Amino acid sequence: CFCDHYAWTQWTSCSKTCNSGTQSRHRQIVVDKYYQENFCEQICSKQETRECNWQRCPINCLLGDFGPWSDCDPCIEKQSKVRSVLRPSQFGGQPCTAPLVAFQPCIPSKLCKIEEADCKNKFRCDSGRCIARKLECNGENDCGDNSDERDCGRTKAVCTRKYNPIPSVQLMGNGFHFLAGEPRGEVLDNSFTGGICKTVKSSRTSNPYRVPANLENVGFEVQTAEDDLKTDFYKDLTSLGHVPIFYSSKRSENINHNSAFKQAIQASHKKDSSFIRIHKVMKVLNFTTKAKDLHLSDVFLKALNHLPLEYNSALYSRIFDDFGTHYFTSGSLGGVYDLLYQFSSEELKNSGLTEEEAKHCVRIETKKRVLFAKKTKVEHRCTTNKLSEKHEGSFIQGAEKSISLIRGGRSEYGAALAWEKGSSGLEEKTFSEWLESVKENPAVIDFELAPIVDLVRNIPCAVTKRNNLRKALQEYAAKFDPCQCAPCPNNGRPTLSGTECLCVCQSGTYGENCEKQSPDYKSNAVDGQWGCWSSWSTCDATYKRSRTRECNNPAPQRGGKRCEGEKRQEEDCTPCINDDEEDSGCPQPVPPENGFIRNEKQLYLVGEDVEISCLTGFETVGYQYFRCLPDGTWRQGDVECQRTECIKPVVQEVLTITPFQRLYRIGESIELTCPKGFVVAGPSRYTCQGNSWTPPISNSLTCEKDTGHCQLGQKQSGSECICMSPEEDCSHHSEDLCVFDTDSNDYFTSPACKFLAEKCLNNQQLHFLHIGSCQDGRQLEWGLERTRLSSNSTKKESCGYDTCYDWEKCSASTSKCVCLLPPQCFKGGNQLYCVKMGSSTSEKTLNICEVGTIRCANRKMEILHPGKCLA
Ligand SMILES: *[C@@H]1O[C@H](CO)[C@@H](O[C@@H]2O[C@H](CO)[C@@H](O)[C@H](O)[C@H]2NC(C)=O)[C@H](O)[C@H]1NC(C)=O
Ligand SMILES: *[C@@H]1O[C@@H](C)[C@@H](O)[C@@H](O[C@@H]2O[C@H](CO)[C@@H](O)[C@H](O)[C@H]2O)[C@@H]1O
Ligand SMILES: *[C@H]1O[C@H](CO)[C@@H](O)[C@H](O)[C@@H]1O
Ligand SMILES: *[C@H]1O[C@H](CO)[C@@H](O)[C@H](O)[C@@H]1O
Ligand SMILES: *[C@H]1O[C@H](CO)[C@@H](O)[C@H](O)[C@@H]1O
Ligand SMILES: *[C@H]1O[C@H](CO)[C@@H](O)[C@H](O)[C@@H]1O
Ligand SMILES: *[C@H]1O[C@@H](C)[C@@H](O)[C@@H](O)[C@@H]1O
Secondary structure (H helix, E strand, O other), X not given: OOHHHOOEOOOOOOOOOOOOEEEEEEEOOOOOHHHHHOOHHHHOOXXXXXXXXXXXXXXXXXXXXXXXXXXXXXXXOEEOOEOOEEEOEEOOOOOOOOOOEOOEEOXXXXXXXXXXXXXXXXXXXXXXXXXXXXXXXXXXXXXOOOHHHOOOOOOOOOOOOOOEEOOOHHHHHEEEEOOOOEEEEEOEOOOOOOOOOOEEOOOOOOOOEEOOOOEEEEEXXXXXXXXXXXXXXXXOHHHHHOOOOOOEOOOOOOOOOOOHHHHHHHHHHOOOEEEEEEEEEEEEEEEEEOOOOOOEOHHHHHHOOOOOOOOOHHHHHHHHHHHOOEEOOEEEEEXXXXXXXXXXXXXXXXXOOOHHHHHHHHHHHHHHHOOOOOOOOOOHHHOOOOOHHHHOOOOHHHOOEEEEOOEOOOHHHHHHHOOOOOOOOOOHHHHHHHHHHHHHOOEEEEEEOOEHHHHOOOOOOHHHHHHHHHHHXXXXXXXXXXXXXXXXXXXXXXXXXXXXXXXEOOOOEOOOOOOOEOOOOOOOOEOOOOOOOOOOOOOOOOOEEEEEOOOOOOXXXXXXXXOOOOOEEEEEOOOOOOOOOOOOOEOOOOOOOOEEEOOOOOOEOOOOEEEEEEOOOEEEEOOOEEEEOOOOOEEOOXXXXXXXEEEOOOOOOOOEOOOOOOEEEOOOEEEOEOOOOOEEOOOOEEEOEOOEOOOOOOOOOOEEOOOOOOOOXXXXXXXXXXXXXXHHHOOOOOOEEEEEEOOOOEEEEEEHXXXXXXXXXXHHOEEEEEEOOOOOOHHHHHHHHHHHOOOOOOOOOOOOOOXXXXXXXXXXXXXXXXXXXXXXXOOOOOEOOEEEOOOOOOEEOOEHHHHHHXXXXXXXXXXXXXXXXXX
């Protein structure tokens, strides 16, 4: 039978327009005579099916509704608001572009707020940083602003000599964002030096460099070897798979670089690709970040505080962006020559070289052309194979291009090392230029990390904002997980970059979604891959809570690897928590009896003094200060409060105190006495009052020599008194007198004894005046006015004076003259009419008696002239 007698219908339309439908067509069979007779039913196929439109349907970015508005209390009154990427762009879908989090102007719950409570016995840099007072006036900027050193009068040097800092030491203190493979903000302070002077010596470079406190180990010895120039081969990039965990870049050897990988994945699509990598680290330093008590950076520490206590996904994640994900525990500093070469697997297979051979040809070619390798034998296996043959014997130039994974130096210079047709990169000149840059701009290389979380350990609520942080981090990485991705054409393994999913191709496949396969590639299996996690479960009676993934997404198929890991995961679950805990002076001392301390407190500083004083009627005897001992104990003098006591008065060896005591009690008297010829000038009895006497003449007291009817004017001889000679008879100077001389208009001092004696004859020429030595006084003037009365006056008195003025009267052995009232003018009074009274302010008539009685008593008037007055 001829089957095409019954012709095909048209293919139907494809059941789908993408993601691979089917279509069919069938013979147009009529059961006619010819049909039944030619066994057409037994021998003809009657239908055809085939797949169609197997191109992937493009998937467009899908964001979600926004979250609840976010309160604001920065000095920037803006409101943060977030939505997230539900579905990531794929296979040429529309990428997402309306930014994830949008902020606006805000209404403040509280006006601009700043904090002030931080430093107790610590010192406050005016920057606000709080450092150990120990670190003050020590010849070193420990504050930053050097405030801790401003006007220091003298300083305790930490370091004997000025040592210089490791240059670029800060780079080992900056944060590391794992996912993005780039260093972020300064996170450790690595200039901080604690006052402690640790140092370390460069090989063959003069003076030691100054190690900072955070570096437990620094190294300057640099090894050179072949081992250092390493090459790997990659049949495809799916190999790179090795939650971010603390690792080493010696172990992983799988680098993410913001563009690096993506370029290479994009390259891998252009055609069936294999990759040869070749790198060589170029060190200037080892270094080991000391494990605990790291000195954070200002800016980091500040920001790491303005973080709320209650969990807050939005603002926590922000630290990762700003500061990173890890921080360097150990590493080196310099640069890394690192190039991923891209080779077309058809070329390689046509070259017939094995991986080991090809890796080698790139090794020795790099060595000759880029590194300045002294000289070497040519190797025809690398030079005359079918690939190198088409490029003047270069194997490297058989590549499509190189991608640069170089770290170190300025990017301009790294980029040049990456060859492509007609470009630079296989010229020594080029390599040396980069190499310069790498000294001028090192980078941390060959380095292990640690989660940035283990750094936030000594703030107010460390343990709080620590677990607050692991949460904000888990959810951070959640956001970058490839599970969100639709699966890929041939066991391609999806990887999320930003908000789109690039397909990483298995060797033997290319095309923009790894759809095209080369004639070698055969498989048709499908390895399993986790769908996304599930949502957390309600917290249980037990801490127990739950989460769940399903090995769907690409469901495992046709003998393809079931996805490996867990379908479920259990963590436990049921405030402001501090971090765990890792001189003091003395109490008020006890006075000695009858005293008290001059300063009451509950607590004294070690080394403080307090003074002991005494109640009234007592005085301290002994050192009067107690000192606070480090002990918490008081150092005490033998001090006490003794009762007041007078001591022994001013001893002139002449006098004799009695009772003789060395100390007298308040209330007891002494009797000062002198020998027979002598008598005490002052009183004979002083008494002890409050530790002084009544009162101690301090030498103004010694025993001077102090112990008949003739009346002492004349001396006896023949039972009859006769006038004594003044220059021959007068011995013991009588009291010194002040006598006046009418004949000489002159006064002078004289001994009474002589005066007396002289009186016998000339006395009507010399008049007494004042007791004591001559000296200006009212008496003088008075004795003047007296003597002026002059002639006409007669005197019959003998007090011992013994002369008495007319108006006065001797007191009869009482020893001095007295005044009179005008009433008693018995004896005749010469007529001194003219006199001014003063009271009546007039001139009236008055006798010498009345005139005399007024000048003696009050001396309160002026005598105009003897003889009649105006009145
Ligand atoms: C850090 O660098 C130091 C050198 O500064 C390295 O110490 C050397 O280690 C090698 C072998 O590991 C020894 O042969 C040398 O004797 C060591 N030199 C000194 C001066 O110690 C050290 O290995 C490096 N550490 C890391 C992490 O690689
Ligand atoms: C047919 O034409 C294609 C180019 C796309 O426009 C298709 O849209 C997609 O259709 C598939 C059908 O399997 C849906 O699953 C996709 O979500 C839809 O975007 C169209 O059907
Ligand atoms: C269906 O198959 C083809 C159509 O492409 C025809 O050649 C054949 O004869 C039958 O009709
Ligand atoms: C089925 O449809 C195909 C195109 O999809 C044609 O090539 C064929 O001739 C038949 O009509
Ligand atoms: C889920 O994740 C694991 C690795 O953690 C894969 O092996 C699996 O295929 C899917 O990606
Ligand atoms: C499974 O999915 C969840 C959400 O993406 C993550 O928490 C986890 O890291 C894993 O990707
Ligand atoms: C080169 O040959 C290919 C086929 C593989 O066996 C590689 O491992 C080898 O290096």
